[PDB]
Amino acid sequence: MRWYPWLRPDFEKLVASYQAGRGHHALLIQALPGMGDDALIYALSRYLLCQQPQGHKSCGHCRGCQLMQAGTHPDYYTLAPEKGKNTLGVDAVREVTEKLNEHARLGGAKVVWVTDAALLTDAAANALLKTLEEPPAETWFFLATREPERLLATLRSRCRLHYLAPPPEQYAVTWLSREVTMSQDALLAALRLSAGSPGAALALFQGDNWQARETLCQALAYSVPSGDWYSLLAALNHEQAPARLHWLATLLMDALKRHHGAAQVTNVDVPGLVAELANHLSPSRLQAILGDVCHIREQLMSVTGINRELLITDLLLRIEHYLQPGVVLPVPHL
Amino acid sequence: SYQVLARKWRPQTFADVVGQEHVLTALANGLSLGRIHHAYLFSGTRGVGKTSIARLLAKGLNCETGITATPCGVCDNCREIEQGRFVDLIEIDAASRTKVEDTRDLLDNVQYAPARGRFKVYLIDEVHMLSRHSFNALLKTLEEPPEHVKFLLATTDPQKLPVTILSRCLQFHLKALDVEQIRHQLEHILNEEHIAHEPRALQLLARAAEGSLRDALSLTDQAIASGDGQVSTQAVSAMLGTLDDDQALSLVEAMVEANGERVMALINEAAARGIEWEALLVEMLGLLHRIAMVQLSPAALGNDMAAIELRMRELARTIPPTDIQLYYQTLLIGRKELPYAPDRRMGVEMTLLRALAF
Amino acid sequence: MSYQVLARKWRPQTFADVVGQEHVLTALANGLSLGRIHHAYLFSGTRGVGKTSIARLLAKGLNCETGITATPCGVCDNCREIEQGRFVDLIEIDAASRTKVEDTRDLLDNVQYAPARGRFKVYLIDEVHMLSRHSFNALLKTLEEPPEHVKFLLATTDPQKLPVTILSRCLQFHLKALDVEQIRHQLEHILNEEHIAHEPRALQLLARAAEGSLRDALSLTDQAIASGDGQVSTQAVSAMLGTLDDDQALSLVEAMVEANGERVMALINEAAARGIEWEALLVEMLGLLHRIAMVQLSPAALGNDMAAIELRMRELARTIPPTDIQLYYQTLLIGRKELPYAPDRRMGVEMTLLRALAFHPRMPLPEP
Amino acid sequence: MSYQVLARKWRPQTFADVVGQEHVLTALANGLSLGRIHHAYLFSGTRGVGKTSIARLLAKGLNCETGITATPCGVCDNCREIEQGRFVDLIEIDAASRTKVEDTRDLLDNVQYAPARGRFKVYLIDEVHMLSRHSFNALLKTLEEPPEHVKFLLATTDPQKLPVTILSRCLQFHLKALDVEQIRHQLEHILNEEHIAHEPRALQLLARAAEGSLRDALSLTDQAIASGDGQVSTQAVSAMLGTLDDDQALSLVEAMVEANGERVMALINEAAARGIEWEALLVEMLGLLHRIAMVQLSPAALGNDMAAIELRMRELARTIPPTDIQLYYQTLLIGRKELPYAPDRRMGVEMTLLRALAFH
Amino acid sequence: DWQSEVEFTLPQATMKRLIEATQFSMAHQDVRYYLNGMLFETEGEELRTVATDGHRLAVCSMPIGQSLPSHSVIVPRKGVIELMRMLDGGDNPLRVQIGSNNIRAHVGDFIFTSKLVDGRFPDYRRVLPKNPDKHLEAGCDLLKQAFARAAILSNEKFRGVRLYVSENQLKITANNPEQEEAEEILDVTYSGAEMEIGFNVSYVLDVLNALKCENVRMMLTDSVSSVQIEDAASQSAAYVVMPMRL
Ligand SMILES: Nc1ncnc2c1ncn2[C@@H]1O[C@H](COP(=O)(O)OP(=O)(O)O)[C@@H](O)[C@H]1O
Ligand SMILES: Nc1ncnc2c1ncn2[C@@H]1O[C@H](COP(=O)(O)OP(=O)(O)O)[C@@H](O)[C@H]1O
Ligand SMILES: Nc1ncnc2c1ncn2[C@@H]1O[C@H](COP(=O)(O)OP(=O)(O)O)[C@@H](O)[C@H]1O
Ligand code: BEF
Ligand code: BEF
Ligand code: BEF
């Protein structure tokens, strides 16, 4: 985890409520990946488990502070899936629930952090319902998610929903330029592909995934003028189908914006590719391709154990079929 | 011993329950007339009072002042049930305890006489989350329980319950609370708690909570937590990220004339202001509905938005009803699909751009 | 006093009490009269149709002290402890706790023992479909031939989940869901026997509300009695179920058909003040629309009820061609499906009705 | 006034009283008379086909004072002790009861000890396919070199789950499911001997409903007698079979294709009285239509699963153009899509069938 | 950091007796989390230990001679089991420290520490029957032997006996899922109406095992209320058994 500069005012807007004694026991933070919600949860937990706070901040070397730094605080709770799995089971939250019944070991607060509420199995959510609704005295909860709508309705009904607004685009561009050094168009592409999340832009740049984006761009430079989208297979099928499909769908979206002329698009680093996509493709075909790409990305994200390669190959074959004249194109309905 | 609005204002008598009169009347008359079932399933959406009504029924059933529809609230049993420390009221979470040994625990526990109260009451929450093993093994104990055992069930959705489970229990459907009932409850709570409030803020909070009082109280607590503990219109609007009719009307008039430049620029500006895309689509659908209203009957037009009725009437006049219906359907489908999009802004842009190509 | 629940108090105790299920009643009575008592029974039906009660009645008939009679004859000791739930010959076994063969074997090794003061050791393995395949094949041998004193009564809801091998060695008896008239007749019996005033319309609504079982009908009747003060009325039953007055929804569908907007608006904003949930308004309208569609299919599909508005059903069927009915039903169904995402439930219902108006097949809304 | 169950009261006692399985009976007789009996016999058939009856008769042939032969005798000591189920060394084991390798090993520790009576120690294991792999391997290891007076009899409904290596150790017999003629004749003989009034059409209905199993035929005969007071007429069996009818989806497809609205309404009301889930009914209707399309593509698309209603399916495939099949499949697909949001699904399924009938 | 809310300087054998009196009547992984433990209560010169699980109650109230403020805390099952595992029959003066959230015990040269269950233990006073009119006084060992004899054929899944109380004879009747009957008769001195009352023989046997006295007295009210069991010559500890439905 790491702290972010723009991230301070929200922390000040929550820790003040907690010092007033009127803070909700269950705070649900909605934030995109890389936004820094884990930073808020960890800092707030350190403040809560701190014995004598110093200006709503962790006070150096307190016994609570010492046990927080050591990571073995008896009254601190972390709920994360086992590293060999991506779901939080019934027993992981059940042990938390049954061991929360006892008093705080140090006589202070009892703070619980669920790393990602989206990963919670519906059974784990239903188990946590009772403890969220009526927690014992001096018990506080922290949940994080990309989108609260994906959560269980009765789960989020018991928590105060805080929102982490992404920083202004110019400020985010300045931060990215300070961290990584490249052209501003690449920074804009990363930001608008990351839905305004600069941490996700750092994650994209630091890894090799941006080079894979460049590879996909080249494969599209050959793919759209010849109707050879199947060749994009190797560009998409490397354990990152959601990300590559997101970039492709965003390229299609930018071409569609180029049709209904817009001042701003996402893929500003490749204007020529966007122009080629707009010129060589019918707008209805672009609609169908973008919708099918989004649906396939959703299916890849949702279903576990699915074959990425077969789905991407079928997607490419369907795009090829859509390219032919006289084909009936899908439209979202019902 | 601070408590948040919801639990701090949990109903304690049948007179403190907002709405749900159709089940409260039957419950009180069953308590008074001596007709008491052994199994009650209170089913409804979140934050409508299933747990509260179940606890009130538990209080009334075993009050030592006799089985009454109006529990005293000062007796030993009433206080112990209110605090949750009563032994004869066993509160079980079905998801937490869905196992063969837990079912056997229930089956051999129901055989012993109650320790303190008149009846041994089992309050199971989210009952639909039991396993089929647990449902089938608990059929008899819900069909013909002992004379001193009564069961209370509470599920968010009865459809996931076995139909044979539904057959052997008393179905209490809790309607989602009306906007006026919710707003009056917020007004009463804030007056009793000496918190300043504004009627517009209460209306916004009531509309934001989709007929659920717990959601209304959580949004209220958020409103107190932002803006020095006052429920004001500005604070509620900033918290909910809502926008007035001007921006949504400009968006709709841009979209209906297929002005891609204006629609895209307005969406960019809306993203810059950090507005709620879901709220933007909600205002879209509301304005389209009011356009169709004006189209149907000239007098069926709102009076609050008199400043923007000038363009409103013109747009309602110049657009066929079928096109308005198509725009409404497209925006509704986009709102439905919004959570599953790669980005919320990306999804709403998809919806609006699809609406443009009409 | 106590007023033991209708289901518990008014559970049948004789073959002269069970309503419906004429086939299984005749089979049991005739077989007991002839003395051809099979060792394995499979009562299969939906919930609340009488499998458990009929099985208890058969167990009573088998072990009457007077003799082997078709119906449970003069209720002697054994019969009256059976009806009290006390064991004379009734080993009531939930199959969910004995799915494993390690427990079915324990069950089987106890069968070879004479019953106490009874003529049979009647096993009531309920929800028998919940057993495991290993357990099925384990108790397969005992099913094919049990001891003379051991009878098997298996009751389940879905016989398709059963293996065909165990299905072979069982008398299969399927219990049809009871008709609404039989349910209403039984409820009237109960209310006359309980000295509680009742209204015919309320009983008809309750009987329709139950989906073919008398357990749901009895639970609903208890809820309606609680809604009243020891009586059931049309007002109380309608408020309990949430169903609105058919005149309102029928006027609304009439106005939608006639393609007038002002009447639709008047009807909907009057229905707003009556405290009827909007989704049920849409459900009632869709139900009516399908009712006219079925009337179009055949005059057989009108309904014994809905007589107060049957003439208008027939008139709407005569006037409107099936294509328009299909269009209206599709529009209303799509609107109901879209309702959760509308700005407001009333907003969604109003927009759905206005959409049906705008795309009216014969009189669409005027366009500029 | 016995009035015992006709199933076991009429179990075969001599090999000449077994209906069908003639080749198996001939092979057993030839092995018993002239050849040397194989050290292990496996039996595989359908439910209620005769497997355990044949195995018990073979065990009776093995242990008898007249010697190891096909038709040994009547009312002898060993034959009677087997027929009464009281025979000592005729071990009867349910495989599902003893799938554990430890219980199987304990069972296979008994082969060494000599038989208490007769000549051969016969083991009869039912549903042998359910044995665990370790237990199955132990059974093969004890079958490769059995004692000179120890023999194994195995039965199973589905032999496809048995590993191929079982063929290396035991001689297998497959019993063919009885046809309508054999079942009808055996039921006629049983009723004639029991002095039960009956009609040939009632017997034909019972045999067709039996679906090849004689135990099913006997159970249905018992139910028919119980309901009909011994008078087994055509109408009684027809009504009581209609009470047990579950071919509703097929009849719905047939009537909807024939544009028979009243028939579809009667059948859907009957299905409602059956308390069948509507989503399952619609998905199995879709499956039936898909199967019709596939068997239209190629006659081999059908299997033995639908070998009960294959005649009507072949007729439907022959008579219905593929375009109508595609239209009906699309109509039922959209009906299933719109079913959850419809009113009470009893009428949603109705109106989906209405839309299907509209294509007339 | 420790603020001793309640400090006991008590003989370790005394608290050994206290816990052994009420250890068995305890909840194991029960739904009611507050019952998964044992209540320590302090009233003047009296130390009380209460333990219940909804079917049993065991209270042991013993004077200690030292006056302390009234208090009530719940120690979890694991803590008291560990204490018993470590507690011995010696003369070391045990020292109990009661704080807001934790329990501590200085025992000779050992230290035992545990947390406390955050909850309120139910009031045991109302659990005790308020009309203990009927009295069955009989030798403890005779009752133990009779109950063990009647419980010989009782199954683990079905453990329960019916007491028929008459002028003098006490009848213990036990049945089983195998439907076989066991009956025992005792010459307990009694005077009252004939009655029938069913309890789990395991709980009653445990209650008798906790009573190392020559005879006991059972206080009874009616056929549907709980039964109290106590020493016929001492009031240091009482037990409550809830009847079973028949
Ligand atoms: N009918 C009602 N009257 C008053 N408050 C209510 C009502 N319904 C819900 N609430 C509020 O919601 C909070 C949670 O209510 P609860 O009864 O647990 O809802 P649920 O049915 O979803 O379990 C209560 O603490 C109370 O503040
Ligand atoms: N045929 C019937 N006649 C009368 N009452 C019935 C009948 N079937 C069901 N009931 C009602 O339902 C209650 C429970 O019926 P039950 O026999 O348990 O159904 P199940 O077959 O699902 O176990 C009975 O007490 C009775 O009131
Ligand atoms: N070939 C047959 N001849 C005579 N009776 C048979 C025959 N097949 C089945 N049966 C009848 O069915 C009953 C059970 O037969 P069984 O051989 O156990 O069938 P399975 O093959 O399923 O084990 C027998 O008691 C007998 O009445
Ligand atoms: F939040 Be509630 F119990 F549906
Ligand atoms: F036994 Be039934 F299904 F209620
Ligand atoms: F005994 Be068979 F296989 F039905």
Ligand SMILES: [Mg+2]
């Ligand atoms: Mg609740």
Ligand SMILES: [Mg+2]
């Ligand atoms: Mg067999």
Ligand SMILES: [Zn+2]
């Ligand atoms: Zn600190």
Ligand SMILES: [Zn+2]
């Ligand atoms: Zn009270």
Ligand SMILES: [Zn+2]
């Ligand atoms: Zn009798």
Ligand SMILES: [Zn+2]
């Ligand atoms: Zn012989």
